[PDB]
Design a protein around this nucleic acid. Sequence first.
RNA 1: GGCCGGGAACUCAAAGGAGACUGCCAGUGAUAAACUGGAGGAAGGUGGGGAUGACGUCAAGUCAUCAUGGCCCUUACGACCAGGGCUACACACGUGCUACAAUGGCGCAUACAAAGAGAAGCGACCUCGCGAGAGCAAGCGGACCUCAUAAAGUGCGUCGUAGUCCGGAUUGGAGUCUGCAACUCGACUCCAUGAAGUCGGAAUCGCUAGUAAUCGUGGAUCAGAAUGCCACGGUGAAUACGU
Lengths: 127, 79, 114, 98, 151, 96
Amino acid sequence: NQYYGTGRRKSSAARVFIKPGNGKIVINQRSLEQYFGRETARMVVRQPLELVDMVEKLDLYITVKGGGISGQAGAIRHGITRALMEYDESLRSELRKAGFVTRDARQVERKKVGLRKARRRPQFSKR
Amino acid sequence: RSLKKGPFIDLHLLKKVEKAVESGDKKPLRTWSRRSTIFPNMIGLTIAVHNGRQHVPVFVTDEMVGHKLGEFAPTRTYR
Amino acid sequence: ARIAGINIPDHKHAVIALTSIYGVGKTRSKAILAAAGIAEDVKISELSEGQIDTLRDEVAKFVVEGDLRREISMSIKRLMDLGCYRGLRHRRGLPVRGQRTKTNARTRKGPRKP
Amino acid sequence: RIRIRLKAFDHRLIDQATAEIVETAKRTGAQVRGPIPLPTRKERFTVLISPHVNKDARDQYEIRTHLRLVDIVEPTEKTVDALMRLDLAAGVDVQISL
Amino acid sequence: PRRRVIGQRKILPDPKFGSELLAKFVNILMVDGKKSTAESIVYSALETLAQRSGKSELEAFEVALENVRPTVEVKSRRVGGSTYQVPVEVRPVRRNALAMRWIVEAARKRGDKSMALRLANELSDAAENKGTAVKKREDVHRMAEANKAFA
Amino acid sequence: AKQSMKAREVKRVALADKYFAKRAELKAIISDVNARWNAVLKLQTLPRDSSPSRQRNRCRQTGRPHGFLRKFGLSRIKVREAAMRGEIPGLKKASW
RNA sequence: GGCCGGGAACUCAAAGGAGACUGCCAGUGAUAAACUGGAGGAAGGUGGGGAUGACGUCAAGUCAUCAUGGCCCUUACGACCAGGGCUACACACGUGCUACAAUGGCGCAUACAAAGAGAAGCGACCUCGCGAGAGCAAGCGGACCUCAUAAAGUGCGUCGUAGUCCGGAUUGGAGUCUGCAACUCGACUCCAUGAAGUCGGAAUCGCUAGUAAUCGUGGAUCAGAAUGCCACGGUGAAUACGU
């Protein structure tokens, strides 16, 4: 049976799958280097796989849509941690400290009346 | 510039232009409509353009065919 | 390198060199080099005298430099002599297209004074 | 076939109307997959609260349009009878089309 | 910040080198909230620094920044109807914070070609000091010691 | 709300079916690149108040020529007065 | 090519529930309230945001949306029509957009959104034009089809500190569109011209985290005119010692 996990990050929803085979990365039918992740947030997809014994442990198939570059990357970040249910909640105890299972409640703020975008009150004239 | 194919004019003034050719020219014609462009047949004739007070005696000339009647009467009084 | 009009640029691209002359800009600049069969990135250096006069003939077709200045100045002066809205608006030193003179006439009008 | 689509304004109105159409159909007939929830289009309006000035305060308005799709898979002559004219319409616009 | 005292939230480290010090550095340089163009300048500056000087990667900018660490700063009082400047020892959190700012602010005043080059020029003259940041580091230093009275 | 300009709306709206709408099929296919004869543009001596976008769209109850919404067909003030008394189904305090 | 069986998992979608109460634990506190920390948890101390604005103040605004006391005009301060004005120009201020650029300009290639709108409508695909658009002309009253090819970003190349490939004003010639109608008085396109301006005086405005900042998109109004206004998302900080 497959080892599934969801995760999401600022309206960006991923669908992670884990298996016992080879460590080729497949995302949206595309490679990890061909998933354009060169600058900061390059390895945030493998941030939950930072402090683990891997070498080349598992098959991984992931698929993210919605949001942008960093939002999709954090969806993969939080998605892989849910997919670690192959090792149940034993490895979570150490993963709690890292705060990758922690889902980000920070969402973009609504535009408000008499404000430029959510906060900035438009300047007034002198006194 | 604008108005696509064909220069737009009013019907009542077209009759006035053809009246000046057929019946013959006499005096400056007092017209309220500023929408109609000048044509080649209007060269030589006299008209008068209203603009919020009284009709200004404007004379038609060869190179005025490109421009409108209302261009030659400025509406806003200054000085 | 006289190049038809009195402007003589050098040590730059051919696309830049053209736009420096009066009555020619970025669109025509590409069209003259494309018509003559010249590259965009090649400079005025390493260009023979027999390659200059081919491009000289292309710019010689369209009216440029002092001939275009008088042509535009004819359409300014002639239009002023009509006594039209635009005609009175040129001579008095004010916006012709119908921009707002309430505030920000500063380009066509000129600097503030007492 | 029996491709039904309705629209209701209130957060819970159709939920009882699209409930009663199920047990009317599935009891006498068979199959009846059930009410698909579908996306709710929400037309948001914003207008000025005072008749003169006071733009900094405005009251925001919204109208939620809740869809449902029953789709009975069994078109038996027994189940089509004793089903129609049990809608007991509360306003909601019944439509039967592809 | 009258009643409420914050928990001082921690930013994530540098994605290449792993240094949390450089995570703040890229953010000082970052204008328009562009981390991708910010770091591209930072790495291009740091690569040219360690190559020219012939030192290691991490301790090139660290020892450079250690020269531009301010010893003390002053704070305006306004109590008895007059301006009193009182000198105070800047803590290690605020010490390197002002250091990274005055490096980026000094490189901002230069009239050189690229941001990687002009920032690296100030990093190059950090160890042996002729530039504008290393002048800017001890501005209040002359005003300090004179205000040793108020303590 | 000035019953004359509201009566001027009743004239302006009611002319739209007679002079235009049906007989405004002229100028649609007629004023187009075909085959020219300029007698088609001489039909524009019609009264003009039938024009398809000539009405301000005043509020149906009062007649304010400002803040009109095409959905409700009313002005923002008469929207709020009605909205707070219900009447629009699905309308309530918007927040999200 | 989720495209076609199929598969109902999953995301997504909208109905009903659980879940966060200083309670479990530790310390302080009159042993109470409460506070500080820890554990668990996706979310801990009114979770984040909106809605939600007491008794009253400023005789604050609105007789111009409407309603209405009184007053006043009534072959006119009413009513209809055409043209004009509200868009004026020696001036002063506010509120914004767009810049002064190499965290950048230009050109080519390329990746990733959300929220909407649409039948007197939004318009594929296709053909014509450099272009604004025009002719031909599917589907969709709408998770289907249309607007819609989002930009920052990223990969190469060029530009290399200048009033410049910065910057776009102004003006000229020549077009399109909506509409009876574009001169006063438009939007938008083409060619050409290329003012000022190189971080701005006293002083002054906002913002504590998905915020400032920056880069795009949609709607309402509306035949046609947004840098405004409303709504949405991308990337995304600095600093809070303290009153």
